[PDB]
From a paper:
The ER membrane protein complex (EMC) is a multiple-subunit complex that is highly expressed in the ER membrane and plays a central role in the biogenesis of membrane proteins. Specifically, the EMC is responsible for the post-translational insertion of low-hydrophobic transmembrane helix (TMH) of TA proteins, as well as for the co-translational insertion of the first helix of some multi-pass transmembrane proteins into the lipid bilayer. The EMC contains two distinct transmembrane cavities - the hydrophilic vestibule and the lipid-filled hydrophobic groove - present on opposite sides of the complex. Here, we present cryo-electron microscopy structures of human EMC in apo and VDAC-bound states at resolutions of 3.47 Å and 3.32 Å, respectively.
To address this issue, we applied various computational techniques including optimizing the box size of particles, selecting particles with maximum resolution of 4 Å, and utilizing no-alignment 3D classification. These efforts resulted in a well-defined class of apo human EMC with an overall resolution of 3.47 Å. The apo structure of human EMC exhibits a tripartite organization, of which the luminal and cytosolic modules are consistent with the recent structures of human EMC. In the transmembrane module, a three-TMH bundle of EMC4 adjacent to the EMC3-EMC6 core is ordered, forming the sidewall of the hydrophilic vestibule. Collectively, our human EMC structure unveils the complete architecture of the horseshoe-shaped insertase cavity of EMC, which is enclosed by the L-shaped EMC3 segment and the nine-TMH bundle of EMC3, EMC4 and EMC6. The insertase cavity opens laterally to the lipid environment of the ER membrane between EMC3 and EMC4, creating a ~24-Å entrance for the assess of substrate-TMH. The most striking observation is that the EMC3188–210 segment undergoes a dramatic transformation upon VDAC1 binding. This segment forms an L-shape architecture in the apo state, playing an important role in the formation of the hydrophilic vestibule. In the apo state, only a portion of the TMH2 in EMC3 is visible, which protrudes away from the hydrophilic vestibule. In the apo state, two dynamic elements located near the entrance of the hydrophilic vestibule TMH2 of EMC3 and the TMH and C-terminal cytosolic loop of EMC7 remain idling in the membrane, primed for the binding of substrates or cofactors. Within the hydrophilic vestibule, the EMC3188–210 gating plug adopts an L-shaped conformation to provide enough space to house the substrate-TMH. Taken together, our apo conformation of the EMC denotes its role as an insertase ready for substrate binding.
Numbering used by the authors:
A (entry chain E): 2 to 104
B (entry chain C): 4 to 95, 111 to 261
C (entry chain F): 11 to 110
D (entry chain D): 12 to 24, 41 to 122
E (entry chain B): 2 to 297
Write the structure that this text describes.
């Protein structure tokens, strides 16, 4: 799922860049002709707004963690069996050691 | 829109200045990380630091504690006869977040290199009293203040990426074994100053100022209730098998 | 509610700020691509921020109490710094296309 | 008792323990409520912002009337500190 | 199943699973070693920072399981990258203590202490060495001295409590578990263990305190059935004792009866999972009925 969102964001960014290039070409043509104070066509403006909204949707979905405020639910499935043993004090005197000695 | 500019000035000014400021910020961050040095720590200072943490957790979490043990702890800390805080006594340019000088120097060098230039105009209407700010090298009185020079461009650029820098970077939390050592280091770095006597007296009086309110007495609230979470919870524990 | 973990709150705040920054940065690029007056640009930035806030609220929906204690930071948060980084990218592509 | 049948019973036969005390030492009773000093302290805390203005007045006088980056940056943050302190007066008022 | 498990797997999932194993600090030295040398021979390309901790964990597991050859194989690689590192020295001393000649690991620990004054790991390993070498009383003494000198480690508190458990000293273990509960009030496990220790002590007031702490941890998680069993047994025992008030006996009987219905329903909706759960349900049903006749 995240890969699809990343691809959609990339496609939206590419569409935005293409709309930018089209607007730049429009302004370059406008500089050619005297007067004719007209705005850029509305179709490209709608396309760039569509690219603005599409990339704005996946940018929220990419980084969603929203971890729970309560910390009692994170030590909830953990049992006391694993907590009893500690990495610090570790005695290497067990029957399994001499059981596994020969293979 | 006027003042037709060349297309070969935008490719030799804007991109260079943007890359320069970006990588200057990156250099500053990485060099600050590199120059960071650890501080020597005496076992005694760690000792009183952990004692202070213990007093703090006693103050914070004291409701879920038997009353007898609570007064035992409070007496041991206080102990008017001997007391541990009372007897145990020990014996006793202007660099201020230097980040403005480098940016000022970089902006000054950039402005010195570019004498007469027009980088970009700002859409925002600006007054004529900021014209000496913005141009600083162009001899024009009829021109508007919208067209700014490279100095203001870089000045706005350094603030433009201030929040962008944190997007690439972030925080780190690992090394469970080294986490404890980090906690001791930071806590004793808090407890560096040599004012042990007044801190001990302040903590001694603050501990007396605390009262006791056993939060365990309110048990009747749970007895009259409903246990239905323990089967919606139990239904979602069954599907998982054993690896 | 009695016990609160600071790590979860910090992560939530970091995610919210990252989203607010990225959305503002792209809104600046859009405004620079179109090119408007200051009043219209500021109103457009405010509209984009409101739309982002509405989408963020819709993202949570049900069970938002455990996710966020309140809603004030979701509505009002990162409005000045986000505008500061939006002004950069608004004028970055504005004069690059029109003036140049 | 025999009603429970199975009844496993467990018996127990230098002061190194940190807090475990041989002597119980009860009879602690502290009733101290000194609100007037707290009120005087909190009253003086709210007087700090009123006194924090005169030296910024003196600094703005020392700045002069020269249009430059350093003075305008001083002035921009001179008013930002109050407005940033006025964005969260609700919590301070409540506490 | 070995080849089958080795087929439907990726290296990323292996590394994530081992990271989770390290987070849970479980004992699966067999499985840790089994996946350890596999990622060492299959990928052996990148993630050096991860692979250092990987090597350390693998040799820790191999010291436990059966294999010192891989232990030395990882020791030489760890020494190659870091010439002077106290962690490698501690691990080597641990392996030496495992093999023979504990005194050599001992003077290694004193040299480590001479170099770095603040080294908790070396002192903990010395304490564990004298735990198994001599009597536990001396080890308790040194642990108390170190806990005086730091007063920072919760693992030291829990180890002291566990060591005091074998000596039938619940008076000091009560203080130890109270201190351990101070720092972590949301951990119901420590509350359950403290209530367990207090119940074992005996006495009506200790019984009431243990019952109330059993009840506190019951509402924090709603996951544990040990706590509810302990609460029901405490209520039954306080009902048994003649030295009590009438009204407290009635309310404790009500507590026990409600716990009985909770037991009945918890075993009841567990019966729809399998077809052999009905026998466990009837077993626990006769158990509760017999204790109900006993109480009534």
């Amino acid at each position: 799922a995240p890969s699809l969102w990343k691809g959609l964001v990339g496609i939206g960014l590419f569409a935005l860049a293409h709309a930018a290039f089209s607007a730049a070409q429009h302004r370059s043509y406008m500089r050619l002709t005297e007067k004719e104070d007209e705005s850029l066509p509305i179709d490209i403006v709608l396309q760039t707004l569509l690219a603005f909204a599409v990339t704005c949707y996946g940018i929220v979905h990419i980084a969603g963690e929203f971890k729970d405020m309560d910390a009692t639910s994170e030590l909830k499935n953990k049992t006391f069996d694993t907590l009893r043993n500690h990495p610090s004090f570790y005695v290497f005197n067990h029957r399994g050691r001499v059981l596994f000695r020969p293979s | 829109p006027e003042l037709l500019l060349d297309s070969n000035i935008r490719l030799w000014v804007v991109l260079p200045i943007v890359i320069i400021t970006f990588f200057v910020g990156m250099i500053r961050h990485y060099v600050s990380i590199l120059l960071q040095s650890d501080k020597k720590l005496t076992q005694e200072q760690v000792s009183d630091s952990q004692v202070l943490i213990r007093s703090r957790v006693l103050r914070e979490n004291g409701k879920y504690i038997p009353k007898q043990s609570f007064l035992t702890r409070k007496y041991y800390f206080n102990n008017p006869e001997d007391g541990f805080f009372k007897k145990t006594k020990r014996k006793v340019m202007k660099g201020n977040v230097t980040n403005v000088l480098p940016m000022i120097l970089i902006g000054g060098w950039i402005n010195m290199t570019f004498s007469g230039f027009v980088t970009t105009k700002v859409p925002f209407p600006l007054t004529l009293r900021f014209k000496p700010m913005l141009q600083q090298g162009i001899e024009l009185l009829t021109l508007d203040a919208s067209w700014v020079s490279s100095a203001s461009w870089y000045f706005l650029n350094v603030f433009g990426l201030r929040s962008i820098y944190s997007l690439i970077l972030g925080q780190d939390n690992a090394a469970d074994q080294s986490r404890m050592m980090q906690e001791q280091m930071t806590g004793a770095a808090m407890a560096m100053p040599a004012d042990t006597n007044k801190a001990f007296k302040t903590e001694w009086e603050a501990l007396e100022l605390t009262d006791h309110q056993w939060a365990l007495d309110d048990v009747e609230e749970e007895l009259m209730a409903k246990d239905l979470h323990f089967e919606g919870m139990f239904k979602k524990e069954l599907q998982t098998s054993i690896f | 509610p009695p016990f609160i973990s600071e790590a979860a709150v910090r992560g939530n705040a970091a995610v919210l700020d990252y989203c607010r920054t990225s959305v503002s940065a792209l809104s600046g690029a859009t405004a620079g691509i179109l090119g408007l007056t200051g009043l219209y640009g500021f109103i457009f930035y405010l509209l984009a921020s409101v739309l982002l806030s509405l989408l963020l609220i819709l993202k949570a929906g049900r069970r938002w109490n455990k996710y966020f204690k309140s809603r004030r930071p979701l509505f009002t948060g990162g409005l000045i710094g986000g505008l500061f980084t939006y002004v950069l990218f608004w004028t970055f592509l504005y004069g690059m296309v029109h003036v140049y | 008792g025999r009603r429970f049948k199975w009844a496993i019973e467990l018996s127990g036969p230098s002061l190194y323990p940190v807090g475990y005390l041989d002597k119980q030492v009860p009879d602690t009773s502290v009733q101290e409520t000194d609100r007037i000093l707290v009120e005087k302290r909190c009253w003086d805390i709210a007087l700090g912002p009123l006194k924090q203005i005169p030296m910024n007045l003196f600094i703005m006088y020392m700045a002069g009337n020269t249009i430059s980056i350093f003075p305008t940056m001083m002035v921009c943050m001179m008013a930002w500190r109050p407005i940033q302190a006025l964005m969260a007066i609700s919590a301070t008022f409540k506490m | 199943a070995k080849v089958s498990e080795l087929y439907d797997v990726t290296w990323e999932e292996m590394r994530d699973k081992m990271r989770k194993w390290r987070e849970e600090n479980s004992r699966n030295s067999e499985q840790i070693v089994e996946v350890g040398e596999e990622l060492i021979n299959e990928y052996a390309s990148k993630l050096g920072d991860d692979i250092w901790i990987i090597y350390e964990q693998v040799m820790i597991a191999a010291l436990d399981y059966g294999r010192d050859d891989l232990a030395l194989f990882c020791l030489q690689e760890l020494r190659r990258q870091f010439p002077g590192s106290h962690r490698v020295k501690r691990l080597t001393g641990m392996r030496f203590e495992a093999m023979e000649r504990y005194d050599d690991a001992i003077q290694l620990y004193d040299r480590i202490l001479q170099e770095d004054p603040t080294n908790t790991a070396a002192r903990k390993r010395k304490i564990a060495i004298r735990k198994a070498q001599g009597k536990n009383v001396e080890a308790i003494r040194e642990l108390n001295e170190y806990l005086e000198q730091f007063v920072g480690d919760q693992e030291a508190w829990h180890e002291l409590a566990e060591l005091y458990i074998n000596e039938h000293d619940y008076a000091k273990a009560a203080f130890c578990l109270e201190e351990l509960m101070m720092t972590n009030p949301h951990n119901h496990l420590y509350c359950q263990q403290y209530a367990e220790v207090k119940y074992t002590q005996g006495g009506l007031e200790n019984l009431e305190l243990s019952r109330k702490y059993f009840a506190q941890a019951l509402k924090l998680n709603n996951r544990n059935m040990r706590a509810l069993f302990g609460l029901y047994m405490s209520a039954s025992h306080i009902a048994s004792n003649p030295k009590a008030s009438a009204k407290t006996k009635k309310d404790n009987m009500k507590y026990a009866s409600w716990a009985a219905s909770q037991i009945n329903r918890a075993y009841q909706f567990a019966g729809r999972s399998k077809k052999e759960t009905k026998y466990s349900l009837k077993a626990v049903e006769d158990m509760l009925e017999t204790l109900q006749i006993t109480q009534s």
